[PDB]
Structure 1
Amino acid sequence: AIEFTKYHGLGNDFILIDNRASKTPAITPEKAVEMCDRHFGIGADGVIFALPGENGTDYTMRIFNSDGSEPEMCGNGIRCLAAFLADLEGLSRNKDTYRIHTLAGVITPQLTPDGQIKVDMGLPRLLAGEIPTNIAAADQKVINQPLEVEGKTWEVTCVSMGNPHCITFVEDVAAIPLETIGPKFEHHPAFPQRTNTEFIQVVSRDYLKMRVWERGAGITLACGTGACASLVAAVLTGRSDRLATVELPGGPLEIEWSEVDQRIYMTGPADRVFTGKLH
């Protein structure tokens, strides 16, 4: 009886639910796990609810990861949600931007003329207490710091986009055994709320290649918050400029850490795949 629409942003794929009738998400986290199961359910990286606006915003977004946990933001999902909201509003839509309340703060996607969606992702949070991580003291940044993972010491940089990211720079990202090492970062004791983990190969100062092991979702084909965080980490470590393409397994995102307002802007696509109803 549940109607939904399947979207993906660069192959990070989501079940979108019109939840305008209530501030309460209409499916539980447990049911979201069942719906995200790729064989027994619909199959997705997460469920996204289009919820009533709060505190002057146009709408609210909540998301459950495919493990049922509730993260604070999602960039690919915000793009999908903006596309979904435009589809719901149809010819009643009177603007090209939505102000969206999230657990991380207000996030503003803009539907651009060429079909892409450009998102004001807010300010990156750089202090260890904001990640959160215990690698450094709460009031310190975490830049090129050591993390021992199964006896091997990695150099990592942590950044939060509302959610935690642990970024490490590598010579050959395709060679990372991501299915094995990803969970060991995700659940490392240094991360009290777990972390997302990005492996970055710098191709040039404006082009990063990324693979990710996501908190609560595993190997995904793209991660918007993670691409933002990785660009921030590349700037902080002197490896990249503030405007770059981040090439993900599912395709490219354009990331800009603006010198005007110090906010991150992320531009990419959103694709509606199919509409469905649960039996």
Structure 2
Amino acid sequence: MNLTIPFAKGHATENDFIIIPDEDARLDLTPEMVVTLCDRRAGIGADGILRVVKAADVEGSTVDPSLWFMDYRNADGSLAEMCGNGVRLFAHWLYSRGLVDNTSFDIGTRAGVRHVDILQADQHSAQVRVDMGIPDVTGLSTCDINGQVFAGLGVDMGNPHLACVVPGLSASALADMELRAPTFDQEFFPHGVNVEIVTELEDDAVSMRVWERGVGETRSCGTGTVAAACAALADAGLGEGTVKVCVPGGEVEVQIFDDGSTLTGPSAIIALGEVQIH
């Protein structure tokens, strides 16, 4: 059985997803089908798949069963918890297709309920704000990238980060760096770490590159932008504030409070079609 599946392609700061509508919970999307669809040259190509289903139809969903549930799969076929960027696209999809009736709403995920606000949306483009939780600064550590040692802050955003504000780092020197997989303290980070290399806060903005664990450099890491803003604010003596974070895939704005944080950024829905697998 080769199967034809209606889909949409989109991205959120160029962290890209295939959206699969399945409002009646009819599709059994297997790991193998995930991989096949996300293969960029043989399939459609993406970082992952966002299946659109009600929380009622996801077994083990902890959340209110009337909510839409972001059934997120990584491109390698694994189940994934949550995605700071993919939530924006999922929210954009729900709102722009009239599946929710308010600009402010919740979405279910395997990591719990996520609250979103649509600031602007049409069928192609949106600006979405997501609640990202209290950043938890777990300590002070270092990594080594290609012989050069960087100091950072451990930040727990639900997943582990080492966010390294580099004194003296310009946006051009950042773009010109060669990145390789970092070496780090494996006692501090026993399950691996996402490393952000970040400029100092200047006119309420910074730039970042990120080496995501198990993946390598990416266009954008949503949780990583919050970590980076956390570290930028720390390095400037501030415990709270608003930071524009520039990543290779675009720009986002992070707000850090005492008791929470938000990530605001774009969402784009690029194509609609039908794909045949298998």
What is the TM-score when the length of structure 2 is the normalising length?
A: 0.80
Q: Which moved more, 1:75-84 or 1:154-163?
A: 154-163
Distance change in 2, residues 1:147/1:243 (3 Å): same
Equivalent pair of 1:187/1:194 in contact (CA under 8 Å): no
Match of 2:10 in 1: 7
Which 5+ residue runs of structure 2 have no aligned equivalent?
56-60
Corresponding residue to 1:123 among 134, 152, 160: 134
1:155 maps to amino acid: A
Instruction: Indicate if the aligned counterparts of 2:68 and 2:108 stay in contact, CA closer than 8 A.
Output: yes
How far is 1:219 from its partner?
A: 2.8
Q: Deviations over 1:208-260 (max 9, x none)?
A: 1011222344332222211112112223344666211001112210110124x
Amino acid at match of 2:42: F
Equivalent of residue 103 in structure 1, options 97, 110, 115? 110
Look up the equivalent residue of 1:59 and give its one-letter code.
W
CA 1:60–1:219 in 2, change beyond 3 Å: closer, same or farther? same
Distance in 2 of aligned mates of 1:13 and 1:87:
18
2:225 corresponding residue in structure 1? 227
Partner AA of 1:3 in structure 2: P
What CA distance in whole angstroms lies between the structure 2 residues aligned with 1:151 and 1:218? Answer: 17
Per the alignment, do residues 67 and 165 of structure 1 end up closer, same or farther by CA in structure 2, a change over 3 Å counting? farther
Query: Aligned residue for 2:19?
Result: 16
Distance 1:186 1:245, change over 3 A: same
- Provide structure 1 residue ranges, at least 5 long, that are not aligned to the other structure: 127-140
Whole-angstrom CA distance in 1 between matches of 2:208 and 2:237: 14
Residue 193 of structure 1: CA displacement? 3.1
- Matching of residues 1-279 of structure 1 within 5 Å: 1-22=4-25, 26-53=28-55, 54=61, 55-56=63-64, 58-89=67-98, 93-113=100-120, 115-126=126-137, 141-143=138-140, 145-148=141-144, 152-170=148-166, 171=169, 172-178=173-179, 181-182=180-181, 184-185=182-183, 191-204=189-202, 206-238=204-236, 242-259=241-258, 262-279=259-276
The 1:29–1:95 alpha-carbon spacing in structure 2 relative to 1, beyond 3 Å, is same
Percent of aligned pairs with the same amino acid: 34
Deviation per residue, 1:103-155 (Å, 9 max, x gap): 333211111147411111222233xxxxxxxxxxxxxx223x23356765331
**Counterpart-to-counterpart distance in 2, 1:218 and 1:25:** 31
Write out per-residue CA displacement over residues 53-107 of structure 1, whole angstroms, 9 at most, x where no aligned residue: 35326222232233334342211100100011123436xx421122112233321
What is the rounded CA distance, in whole Å, between the counterparts of 2:29 and 2:69 in structure 1? 16
SS in structure 2 of the partner of residue 17 of structure 1 = strand
Say if 2:155 and 2:162, in contact at 8 Å, map to a contact too.
yes
- The aligned length equals 256
How far apart are the structure 2 equivalents of 1:116 and 1:37?
28
Structure with the larger helix share:
1
Q: Bigger CA drift: 51-60 or 158-167? A: 51-60
Q: Distance in 1 between matches of 2:39 and 2:274?
A: 16
TM-score relative to the length of structure 1: 0.80
Q: Closer, same or farther in 2 for the Cα pair 1:62/1:165, shift >3 Å?
A: farther
Higher strand share: 2
CA change 1:251–1:277 in 2 (3 A) is same
Q: Deviations over 1:14-44 (max 9, x none)?
A: 111223333x973223332222221122111
How far apart are the structure 2 equivalents of 1:29 and 1:186?
31
What CA RMSD, in Å, does the superposition of the two structures yield over aligned residues?
2.7
